[PDB]
Symmetry: C3
Subunit: 96 residues, 3 copies
């Protein structure tokens, strides 16, 4: 049931994607206690996506299923900045 | 208004996609009584999508617009297993 | 926070996409008063997407964040018909 979708205009290689998603899955499992075997995740390369009118690198993260989402947001932002080289200020996490 | 989106990590050929979607549209029209001319459908190939940490074939179906969704879920699962060769246990249908 | 996603089966060139999205962003900023710097937009080419069972050109627009959405819908429809050569009757705008 828990989902995490990372939409990005960064053309992540197949391995960059696995790096980001495995780390986010681990983060969700750790902070929220959800088993890895129930988690669905994806990195959706959207070459046209824009934020603020700019095509500069940007990630939009949707996490579906809560005081600790502050912590989870922090881990996710650090993960994407590392794996995809996105600016933290251009990582936006939405919880649903 | 009624939508059905099949997200999958299975690289369905153009015709496999039409096979799956025409059959799902027929199923929605039959079980829910919605005219085919109002239905929107799609198969979104998401090469990075993961379930349980695995890239093994998997489909996530979202149907938007209800005792019979049990029946509709059953028809959709059988359809995808046939057309895309996905394991029934790796077909997940969500209604909204 | 405000998002606009245009999903379409029309294989828009990179520039057609920028033409459509910059104009929609301007429309959202003007009608709804949202600053361009807060708006996220995207055009998602979905080659399998169907409406009414047909693969004829079609756009599904989701705008997330209201008497004027009638006006905003009108501007968006005219924009896509111009930039992507879609029939107005095959442009569907959903607000959320």
């Amino acid at each position: 049931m828990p989902c995490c979708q990372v939409s990005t205009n960064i053309n992540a290689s197949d391995d960059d994607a696995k790096k980001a998603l495995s780390q986010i899955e681990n983060a969700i499992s750790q902070v929220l206690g959800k088993p890895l075997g129930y988690i669905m995740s994806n990195l959706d390369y959207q070459k046209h996506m824009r934020f603020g009118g700019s095509h500069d690198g940007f990630c939009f993260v949707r996490v579906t299923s809560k005081s600790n989402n502050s912590s989870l947001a922090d881990k996710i932002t650090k993960i994407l900045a590392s794996t995809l080289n996105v600016k933290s200020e251009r990582v936006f996490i939405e919880f649903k």
